[PDB]
Each structure stands twice: as C-alpha cells, then as structure tokens.
Amino acid sequence: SIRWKLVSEMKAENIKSFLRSFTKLPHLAGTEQNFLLAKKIQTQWKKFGLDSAKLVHYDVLLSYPNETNANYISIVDEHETEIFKTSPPDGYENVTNIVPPYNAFSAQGMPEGDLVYVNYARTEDFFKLEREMGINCTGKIVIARYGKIFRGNKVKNAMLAGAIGIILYSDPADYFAPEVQPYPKGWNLPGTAAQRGNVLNLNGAGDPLTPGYPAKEYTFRLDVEEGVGIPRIPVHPIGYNDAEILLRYLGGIAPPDKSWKGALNVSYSIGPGFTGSSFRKVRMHVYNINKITRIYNVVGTIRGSVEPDRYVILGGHRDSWVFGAIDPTSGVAVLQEIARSFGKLMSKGWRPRRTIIFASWDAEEFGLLGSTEWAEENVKILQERSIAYINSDSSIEGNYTLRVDCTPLLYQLVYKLTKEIPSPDDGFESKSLYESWLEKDPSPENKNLPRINKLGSGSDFEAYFQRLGIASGRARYTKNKKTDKYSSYPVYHTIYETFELVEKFYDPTFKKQLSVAQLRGALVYELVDSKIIPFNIQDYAEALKNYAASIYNLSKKHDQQLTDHGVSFDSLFSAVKNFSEAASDFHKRLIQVDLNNPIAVRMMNDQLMLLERAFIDPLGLPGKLFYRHIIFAPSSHNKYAGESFPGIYDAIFDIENKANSRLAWKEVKKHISIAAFTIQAAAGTLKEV
Amino acid sequence: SIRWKLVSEMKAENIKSFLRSFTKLPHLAGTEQNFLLAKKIQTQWKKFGLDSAKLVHYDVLLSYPNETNANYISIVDEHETEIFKTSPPDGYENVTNIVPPYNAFSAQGMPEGDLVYVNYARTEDFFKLEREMGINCTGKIVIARYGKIFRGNKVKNAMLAGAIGIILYSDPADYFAPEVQPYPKGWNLPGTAAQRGNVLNLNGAGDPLTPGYPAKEYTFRLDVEEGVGIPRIPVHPIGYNDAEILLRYLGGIAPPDKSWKGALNVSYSIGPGFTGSSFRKVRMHVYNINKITRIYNVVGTIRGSVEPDRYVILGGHRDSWVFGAIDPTSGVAVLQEIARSFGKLMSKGWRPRRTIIFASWDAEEFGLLGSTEWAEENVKILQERSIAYINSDSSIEGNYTLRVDCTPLLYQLVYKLTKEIPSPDDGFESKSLYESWLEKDPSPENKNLPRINKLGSGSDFEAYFQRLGIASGRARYTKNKKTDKYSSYPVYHTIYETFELVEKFYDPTFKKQLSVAQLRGALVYELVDSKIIPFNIQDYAEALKNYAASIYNLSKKHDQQLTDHGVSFDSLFSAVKNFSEAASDFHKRLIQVDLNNPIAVRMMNDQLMLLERAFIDPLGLPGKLFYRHIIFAPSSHNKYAGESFPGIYDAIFDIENKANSRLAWKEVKKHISIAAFTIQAAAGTLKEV
Ligand SMILES: *[C@@H]1O[C@H](CO)[C@@H](O[C@@H]2O[C@H](CO)[C@@H](O)[C@H](O)[C@H]2NC(C)=O)[C@H](O)[C@H]1NC(C)=O
Ligand SMILES: *[C@@H]1O[C@H](CO)[C@@H](O[C@@H]2O[C@H](CO)[C@@H](O)[C@H](O)[C@H]2NC(C)=O)[C@H](O)[C@H]1NC(C)=O
Ligand SMILES: *[C@@H]1O[C@H](CO)[C@@H](O)[C@H](O)[C@H]1NC(C)=O
Ligand SMILES: *[C@@H]1O[C@H](CO)[C@@H](O)[C@H](O)[C@H]1NC(C)=O
Ligand SMILES: *[C@@H]1O[C@H](CO)[C@@H](O)[C@H](O)[C@H]1NC(C)=O
Ligand SMILES: *[C@@H]1O[C@H](CO)[C@@H](O)[C@H](O)[C@H]1NC(C)=O
Ligand SMILES: *[C@@H]1O[C@H](CO)[C@@H](O)[C@H](O)[C@H]1NC(C)=O
Ligand SMILES: *[C@@H]1O[C@H](CO)[C@@H](O)[C@H](O)[C@H]1NC(C)=O
Ligand SMILES: N[C@@H](CCC(=O)O)C(=O)O
Ligand SMILES: N[C@@H](CCC(=O)O)C(=O)O
Ligand SMILES: [Ca+2]
Ligand SMILES: [Ca+2]
Ligand SMILES: [Cl-]
Ligand SMILES: [Cl-]
Ligand SMILES: [Zn+2]
Ligand SMILES: [Zn+2]
Ligand SMILES: [Zn+2]
Ligand SMILES: [Zn+2]
Hints:
- The structure is a homodimer of 689-residue chains.
- By secondary structure, chain A is α/β, with parallel strands linked by helices.
- Chain A folds into three domains: 1-65 and 287-534, 3-Layer(aba) Sandwich (Aminopeptidase), CATH 3.40.630; 66-286, 3-Layer(bba) Sandwich (Glucose Oxidase, domain 1); 535-689, Transcription Elongation Factor S-II, Chain A.
- Helices cover 36% and strands 17% of the residues of chain A.
- The longest helix of chain A is centred in the C-terminal third of the chain and has 26 residues, at 661-686.
- The interface between A and B is large, with 50 and 50 residues.
- The complex binds a molecule of 2 linked components (NAG-NAG) (2 copies), 2-acetamido-2-deoxy-beta-D-glucopyranose (6 copies), glutamic acid (2 copies), calcium ion (2 copies), chloride ion (2 copies) and zinc ion (4 copies).
- One 2-acetamido-2-deoxy-beta-D-glucopyranose is lined by residues 136, 138-139 of chain B.
- Chains A, B: It is found in: Cell membrane.
- Chains A, B: Ca(2+) binds at residues 210, 213, 373, 376.
C-alpha cells in the first residue's frame, strides 16, 4: 500500500543525520541561528518536492538576559556583606552564544528578605503552608523545586501567596535517576546545571502583547506593563549545588512529612529565616529584558487533488533553549524525514486527497508563540477546513514505550496504525508497536487497550485544539512510569541536551525515533488520504460517559450542599445519553453512504470534521478567553495536564473554602448547564434531519 | 421557470384572507391566543406539504402589567393631593384582553420629583442639556417624545443622565401625518392612544436570564436582578392628550431652538418644575411584573434533494402588542402565502437543491427572544450550514415604494429579482418593481441603482447576521422619506393596528403586500435552488471601500490628534485593497468552475457561504459580547440603525470629551487594527492557495 511505502521509506539513519546536523549550535528563538535553521528546513522541503515552503514572520515579545547586568541570587549578612552568590558540554567548548540560565519573562527586581521553602509550589503546597503549617509567605522570597507542574503555575501560585521573588531549582529527587552517572558519563543532571524556561501564565493567549490577533507589523500592541501573563515578581533558576547552600541553614518548622523532603543533604526545614550560621537574608538580582523580536515559522504544503480546501497539519517547533537535542530537535529531525518520505511518494506520481500543511514553528519555548500567532492569522480558514493537527515536538523523552495523547476521535486510528508499525523494543523483534505498547502501558479503563491520555497543554497543538476545536494528537517515546519517578528527563531544558546524549544513552540505533516518525507520518497520511475521515464518534461518546461519571463522583462529598443549593447533574447525564444515541445513529448511517456520490460523502465528512468544533464556546472559560473547549482545558493548576469538564471542575474545586456558598454553588450550576447544552448541541450536529 | 411559477402562484386575495384570519384577536407573546396562532400556522404548513412543522419552546423572561395594581402618572400639589392622573377600536368592543399600554421590562417604582423635558432623549439631546443648556437631569423625572431612535436607547440615556423615571409620549409632530384624520376616519394616531414596546438594552443577548445559551428547562438562569439589559428606573408611555397636560405648565428655560418644539399647543419649555399653575410635582406609579413564561416558535422544513445540509431560513415573528395588523401580522400573512406557494411547487414534484427552514418566531416584541433563543440552540449547525436568512416581519409600513436592507452579498440578487416582479404602484402597470423603486428611491452612491440600506437591528435577523455572520436581508413597502416626516407609521404599536386600517388606508388591493411576498419568496428560491450561490463578493469589496472612506472622513477633524498619538488608517486601507483584489480573483475563478464536478462546485459554494462568517469576531465588540460582526453593528445610539466599522466609530465618537486622551486614542488604534485584520482574514478565505 501507499501507507506501507510511506512508512518503510523512513530510515533511522536519516533521522540520526538530520538530528546531528541541527544540534551543532544553539538555536534560541529570535536569534540568527534559529533563522538560519528555518532557511535550511525550507531549502530541504523544496528539495523534497513540496508544493510550497515559505517563511511566515511575526514580531512578538521575547525575553533574554542582559549581557551587561547578569542575574544572580545571593545571601547577605546583617552588615549587607555578600557571603554567597549563585553562579559548555565536552566537544562544545568553542560555542560562544549559549544563553545563561534564566526564566524568560521574569519581572525585574532586587528583592531581599527571609527565605521560605515551598516544596513544588503547587496549589496543594501553598494550601498546606497557609492552612496547616502556620506559614505566611507574604513578603518572603520563596524557594521551590521544579517538577510535577508547569513552572509558570508555580510562579502564579507564589504571587497569589504574597511572595516577593521565587527561586526555582532542580532537586536530585526529581532530576537525578538512581544509579545513573551525571553527564557526560551518564544521562543525569550535574549539580552545576539549571533548567531554563518561560514563566508566563498565558492561558492560550499567544504573544503577550497581541491577544486574539496575529502580531503583524501594523498590529495594535498592549503596553508592555499590561502584556498578558507576565509575572510581577522576579524568578530565576539554579542548580542543586547552589540550592543546597541556600537550603542548608533554613530554620523554623521541620518539613511536615517526607513528601516535602528532596534528596539533598539538608533538613528541608521551611523557614522563614536561617539558623546555625553569616547567613541572614536572601537577595535576588534579575534584570532580563523583554523586547519585541521577529520570529519565523516555515509553512509548506502538498495540495490535495480532490479536496484541496481540507487540511491536515503536521507541525512541530524548532526553537530550543540551547542545543535542544531532545526538545525539540528530535522532533525537528522526525518532521524532516516525514516530509522527505511524502516527497518520495510524490516523485512516483502520488498526490494526497486533501492538503497537507507542514509547519516548523518558532518561539514555542516562549509560550507557543509562533504556532499560536499563525492560528490567529489563519483562524477563518483553519476552523472551517481543518481535519486534524498532528504535533512533531520531542520524539524521545525516554526509551521504554510509546505515549500518545489525543482526542477520542483519533483513538481507533492510533490503535490501527500502531499494529502495522514494527516495534523498536528489544525482545519484540517480530511484533508490532501496538503489541509492545499494550504490554508496557495498558489503559486503566480497559486492560486490553494501550493507555491514551487526554490533551493538556505545553506544546503547539494548544491553540488548534483548545481554542479552535481541531482534532489533535501527539505521540512520542517515554520512560516507564511504574519504575522511573523523576520529572520530564534529567537534562531537560539544560545545556546537556546534546546529540551525544541521545545517541549514547537514549536510542543508539535510532529505531525508537524511527517508530515515532512512522506513526506521526502514518497518522497524517490516513487523515489526508482516506475518502471517509477516520474518526470514530462512538469512542467520544464513551469518553463523555467516563468524564461525566468522574465529575459526578468528585461532587459526592458535597451531597448535602448539592441538595441544599438545588444543584443537579441530571442535565449533563441526559445530554451524554443523547450524544451516545446520536453517535450510534451517525455511524449506522455512515456505513450506508454511497462512496460513489461525492456530495453524500462530503456531507458526512463535514459532520466528522465539525464534530470537535461543536465543543468550542466562543465565550471561553471563566477568566480565560482563549480556552474555549468545554470538554477539555489545560488544568488551572498545571498547564501540562488536561482536565475534563474544566468549567465544572474549577467551579467545584476547593468550594468548601469559598466565602460565599450561595454564589459558589450557582457557579457550579452555570457550568453544568453549559456542559449539558454543549454536548446536546454537538449531538445535534450529527443528526440526519 | 420554477421561479415564475412560485411568484405567479401567490395571490393578493390569499394574503388578505390570511391577514383577516390572524387579526381578529390580540396575540401577545406568552398568551393563549398566540399559542393558538402557532398551532394554526403549524396546521397550515402541514396542509401545504412541508416536510416538518414543529413547535419549539423556550421559557424566557417576559413582562406584563399587574391587573390589580394599574400603572399611571400623576401630578400632585404641595399638599400631596392628586390633581391629575393619566388614564377597543370600532368593531372590537367585545375583545376583553387587550393589554393596557406599558413599557415591558420597566423597573417598578413610585418616583416623585420635578419634570424636565428632554426632546427625543437622544445622545445629542442629553449632550445639549448638560453641555449647552445648563440642565442637570439628576434626580428628575424626564419626559421624552417617542421617535427617531429605539425607545430602549432613550431609557439607557435617561439612566446615564441620572433621571429617576422616564415618561415616553407620542407627539403629533412625529405620529400625526398632515391632513389625515385620526382613526377610524383616517390612519392617524388619536390623542388617547399610547405606543407599547420593550425598553431593554440587550445588545443582542436574547432572553435576559440566559445570555449565550438557549432557555431550556434545565438551563442556568441569572438572578432576575442581574438579567441583561433590564432598566433600573420606571418607564411608562402616554398619548398626547395626557402629555399636553404634563408639558403645559413647565417653566424654566425656553426651548433652545425649533428642533426641540413638537406640535402640541404648549411652550416646550424645559423645566425643571412648573410655573403658572396646583401643579407641583410629577409622580410615576409603575408595577409591571416580570415572569418566566413559555414561548413557542413554529419551525418547518423542506429538505434539499442535493445539499440537505445547507439552509436558507425564511423567518418572521407572529407575536404582536395588540392585533398587530401591520406589525407583524402583515408579514405573518406573507409568510403563509410563500409557504403555500412552495407547497404548490412540491405538489408537482419539485424539491429544492438545499433545505428551506421556515420559522414563525415568538416574543420578538420582548427583545427578539424566540428567534435569538433558537439561534443559540442551533448555533453549531446554523453557523456551518446556513446560506442566508430572509426576514418576514411587517410587509406594509407605508404605500410609496420598496425598502430593502441587506448585506452587500445580496445586492445583485435583489436587483435581479425586482426586475422580474410586476410593480404594484399606480402608474407603473406595465413596468417592474425595480423600475418603480429606482424612480422613487435612487441610491445616493449611484443614481442608476435603487437605494439598499445597511442592516441594523430591531427585528429577528439580528442574531443571524450580527452574532452568527449569516447573510441576511429584509424587504417591505414603506413611506416616501422626502415628503413623509413622521416616525414609523402613526398607529405603530397601538390598539389601532387593525385589519381595517391596512385594507382601507394602506393597500386596499393587497397588491403592494403581494409584491413583497413575491420578492421574499423569490429570494429564498434563488438562494436555495441555484447551483452556484447567488452572492457577489465584488459588491462587498466596493461597500468596504465606501465604509473605509467614511470612517476616515469622520477622523479628519482630529488630524492633529491622529498625528500626535501615532494613529493611522493605512492598515485598514491596505486590507480593503487586498480584499478587492481577492474578490476580483475569486469571481474570475468562479466563472471557470466545472459545473459538472460536484466537489469543485461545493468548494466554491463553501467560500461564498463562509465569506460573511469571516467578519465575526468571537471576542465581540467592547461591552457587547453578542455583537460580533466587525463591519456592521446596531448603532450604540439607536438599535434600529446600522453602523459601519462600529468598533472604530464608537472609539472615536465624542473623543474630544474623553478624560484620558492617551487611553482614548489607543482604543481607536486597537479597533483600526482589528478591522484591518478581519478584512485581510476575510480576503484570505477567498484565496485559491
Ligand atoms: C435529551 O433528549 C431528551 C428527549 O428529547 C430530552 O428530554 C426532554 O426533556 C425535557 C426536560 O428538559 C422534557 O420537558 C421532555 O418531556 C423530554 N422529552 C422526552 C424524555 O422525550 C432531553 O432534554 C435532552 N437532554 C438535553 C440536555 O437537551
Ligand atoms: C495587503 O497585502 C500586502 C502585500 O502582501 C501586504 O504588504 C506587506 O506589508 C508589510 C507591512 O505590513 C510589509 O512588511 C511588506 O513588505 C508588504 N509587502 C508588499 C507590499 O508586497 C499588506 O500588509 C496586506 N495588508 C494587510 C492589512 O495585511
Ligand atoms: C542592560 O543593563 C545595563 C546595565 O544596567 C543597562 O545600562 C542597559 O540599559 C540594559 N539594557 C536594556 C536593553 O535594558
Ligand atoms: C500575612 O502577612 C501579611 C503581611 O505581613 C498580612 O497582611 C496578612 O494579614 C497575613 N495573612 C495571613 C496569615 O493569612
Ligand atoms: C535506555 O534503554 C536502556 C536499555 O533498557 C537502559 O539501560 C537505559 O537506562 C535507557 N536510557 C534512558 C535514558 O532511560
Ligand atoms: C400585583 O399587585 C398586587 C397589589 O399590589 C400584589 O398584591 C401582587 O403581588 C402583584 N402580583 C405580582 C405577581 O407581583
Ligand atoms: C447634578 O446633580 C447631582 C445631584 O444633585 C450632583 O451630584 C451633580 O454634581 C450634578 N452634576 C452636573 C451638573 O454635571
Ligand atoms: C396610500 O396611498 C394613497 C394613494 O397615493 C394615499 O392617498 C394614502 O395616503 C396612502 N396611505 C398611507 C397610509 O400612506
Ligand atoms: N514547552 C515549553 C513552553 C510551554 C508553554 O509555554 O506553554 C515549556 O514547557 O517550557
Ligand atoms: N421590533 C420591536 C422589538 C425590537 C427589539 O427589542 O430589538 C420593537 O422595535 O419594539
Ligand atoms: Ca497575537
Ligand atoms: Ca438565551
Ligand atoms: Cl509531540
Ligand atoms: Cl421584514
Ligand atoms: Zn518542545
Ligand atoms: Zn521545551
Ligand atoms: Zn415586528
Ligand atoms: Zn413591533
């Protein structure tokens, strides 16, 4: 088949050669090297035979350290004397423009005060501090370990708790795998290395200065003081050698339980303040600058021969913090090999039914900026014509098994395709990727199916799925959750994401990366070439039944309050029942369509394409204009995680502590009502008459 | 042709018989008689052969007088003694449930104070009072004449000026045509009759309690105190015999110029307060009740034979204030004759290409409620599938010539069809409706074309056009603007809208009403049956050039401020130029489409259908979530009038009086930028690649 030709043409050695060629130098967004990398990708796409390959630019707010006013954290004594001040990989000694560690979009400032340790700065950590531990973070500098949640959530939470600065650090508990040596001898994080990353709270907005509209040359810009999501306190990241020094002499209360203690040889006492030391106060000194900077997406096409006005997007970012050999450049290499394989099909006369859009996004590391600005520019055509969005970010975050996150529409296609892709895993040499994935990560809701996760955020599908309602999916290799307890991977967002790390420690044969390229490309192929779009709406019906049971179950502890305030889930369960009936009826009619009647086929394909769109509410979610999907949103507590029925979940979260119970329960009733309507409206789009 | 069979089958005598049958009794929304009228229409549609004819209900907030606490206005002396208190047509003496005059959704209250006359309570009238005349309306009861603008705008303006109540009255200057006798001898307004009507400021919201979502049984409802658009002061309407008594002894300043003087034998002095009289203070006593009440739309279909998933809607309201023989029942009679004629085509084997949706809306008089709630219920299918909405409200507001209001997409079709409809006008017996319309109302922008107006609001197309972006149009007979200076028509919204009024004074032969039925039906036919949707996008390009010139011209008096604040219209003119090029290119390709290739035709029809949608911004306009069209919105000063580039217009309106000039000019820059983007995005939807 053509699909088999596409998959079998892809080669591990080509992905290896692309990855080596793209990881010799840093390629930070907005810098010359990342523009050169865009031009290299564009030249390659033209060689591969794509119909178009254009640079599309925007001028967006980015953030960089000031080369002549370096950031640092210090400890001073009571005489204001500085007692302590916080401070390339082998083969890269001559690389001169590695950006020093910082947290992009930090406020500027030089706050000084007592230090308080806040664990992971999660919502439950700050609840514990205020409600159980007697700690008031107002006016304090807080120190938080990285991990568990998106770092911009930590900064939001610290600001809500009243902190005047937050120091982020990498605890070995979270970034040092047991019995692995630090880079370069192994793949662990050395104590000298800090994790970069932005600390915005954009909630889907894109460029901070231009929410809603693409950041073109003429575009209106908010004043920078009003840029969306920009934090109002300084934030800076340090490695664990420096953090150990800051934590060692903290006094005050002991850590409240083992879940607050990391792995350093310190007490993990909370503060505020020091004991047993010259150590008196902590200062931060953070002077990153925010500047409007040009970014460049590469956007290419293969136009459809039958339905050129229908799109499948394969998009992945290419900007990195340093070399980014895993994040994103492993995905950049996969995307080039997928485009090369589609080019080889074209060289033998093939053309897809629908149009493929290839996209290499810029400034993802600064808040999904290039992908979101392109969505904002092209929203009218994208929302009326897009079948699906397949991401192409990091392909290799671990070497254990596959991880897939996608809308329920795509479950059956994912399972189908993984059965036809050879497994790359040791011991599975005559078996499919589906077989090894099922053995290694079975779904909690059905032991005979591999686990597929909900979509959250933190990569470039966000605007497509959560704002525009375009069915989306992502797939990559990952670690074993049962045995590997570190967050992300040890060297994430550090200088040590090198080609050598990937080849020596993650995937020497490049077979695991190859299997990811084959699955991402095969997904695009099936979506773009199949006469009937390969979605299954009965899987969505089943997913809604699960989510409705889950939110109802979370309500049970409030049963008396539901009764007293006249709150019922009946309308939500009724809408889900109606949706299930409509989805069953729709599939019964779909198998009857006359495949030789192009309008009959197009009408049913439009119902398949527009079903995800029905869940999009233009009014958005409370306080979040750009999260419009009523079934899924990024968790308010952790942008990386997806939350189901987010309007209901957020209304009932911590409800027992709301000042006004009558008002709080009416908010729960509002979001139940909106979810019921939205599901019923979605069901209505499937109806025959 | 089939079109000629549709048009020629319609008969003046059938419209007359329908109108007589629907105007014998009042049919106020939410009352038994208007539910019976829905059932009568449904039975008729089934007889005519429609595929479906269903009642679709909602439970919405309505407002009615309290039968046991009647409303009134009084004058009291300084001893609190009431000195004056304000207080069926021939053949209708036995009709028992005529609603007394009131303004639906008035606040309740019994305010007492000095009276001030405020002319038409327009924005410019209150500017004149405060800025030129030295009058402070804070704490006053104001008295305003009806006319010029929507009455809910008057109430909004009075509330902003600080009034504690507003009395509305019908001045003969505005509702008594010269040398015409009052009803029943002629068609003029008697001095005893008051004009009913709602005084909400909904801005497109629909039912006050359920903005965004259809008002179903399970739906969340705002508390009534927070219902959208409900005024916070009492409002009540009176006839001119009563108003003359209230105005006669007003003292204080003389009327400032002749434009403030009406036609009563009083001075038109402004107040506050009285002179020359027992007349000391005015009181209002208004105790209407707001109640959730069931309403019923009738929704029917004729399903398309080729594209059943594409819709043309023919919708008109049927609720009235009393008998409503002009408003809306003349349109109700037209809609039945159109549906009957489509049924006759079906009886000979015809079926349309696309689906026709017929709709008889309820509660239009209470804020477009039935049409807007149905749009909110069905938004997902309507926004993806609707070609157009044709209204069927009043057909006969005067007897001079045609008036058409529609999107530029529809101009060429309207002109085309009117050439093929016989003119009903005396002296035009062998000529077309186009010919008589052109002679009587030539367009100011092109003397060789009849005038077509922009869409504003005040009837049921509003949600379809201004919220959802579905091309809309309306047509009706109207008065001669050059010679007839009264507002609306004299007996508008009074008890005297009777069948006898229409037959004796407006259109005895029913030929003018017939010509309106033929044009509304022919529009539906062409939109629903033509293989290529009959829109012209080059007419839209021309309209945008006109609107861009107009808003730029309004800016000229602020030239120095544009320079000082760095405001430019360049991006707007650039987007309009790009749109014109894209529209020309699109029509060049459209004439080349292979009419025998169904997917090629459907792709181009989708571009025609989705073009109006490109102008819809889900973020809405400032303070108005439900006005989303960037090119048109109802004027902020008069809901009945359409305004072009409303975001820019409202930002620059009265800008010289804004407290903070820097902030005000940045708002103008924001809306110019949004308009430029939106037009460029619309152009992008037309592009081939
Ligand atoms: C699911 O569909 C059912 C059947 O159409 C709807 O049930 C109606 O519910 C209303 C109350 O909302 C009752 O007044 C009707 O009598 C019901 N009709 C039945 C059971 O045949 C139900 O409302 C729909 N659910 C939603 C959320 O729209
Ligand atoms: C209309 O189309 C033109 C041509 O594509 C756009 O012109 C570009 O304008 C930007 C500034 O916005 C310049 O940087 C480019 O050099 C222009 N290219 C030209 C003239 O070929 C113009 O921006 C579009 N208008 C809008 C509102 O998008
Ligand atoms: C960088 O810091 C130096 C030293 O404080 C300062 O003079 C300069 O303005 C800073 N640069 C920017 C772009 O703010
Ligand atoms: C925390 O400290 C601040 C400032 O010293 C004070 O305003 C606030 O009341 C305290 N709040 C608590 C303990 O919740
Ligand atoms: C890669 O797989 C090998 C073999 O199972 C294992 O020893 C190694 O730890 C894995 N690497 C990472 C980075 O997990
Ligand atoms: C109508 O007015 C009477 C007299 O004030 C009052 O008793 C009654 O409650 C009112 N009805 C409603 C529905 O408010
Ligand atoms: C109008 O009168 C009110 C109340 O008496 C007063 O508060 C206000 O300052 C006055 N405002 C004017 C003349 O603008
Ligand atoms: C109807 O037309 C006749 C003849 O021109 C005219 O006398 C009459 O005033 C018109 N009626 C109305 C209500 O304008
Ligand atoms: N993927 C980047 C950016 C995510 C975001 O800004 O949403 C990170 O996790 O740091
Ligand atoms: N057509 C009615 C209702 C209009 C509206 O509420 O927008 C009137 O003008 O009174
Ligand atoms: Ca933007
Ligand atoms: Ca509603
Ligand atoms: Cl990915
Ligand atoms: Cl109308
Ligand atoms: Zn990434
Ligand atoms: Zn990253
Ligand atoms: Zn009407
Ligand atoms: Zn009316």
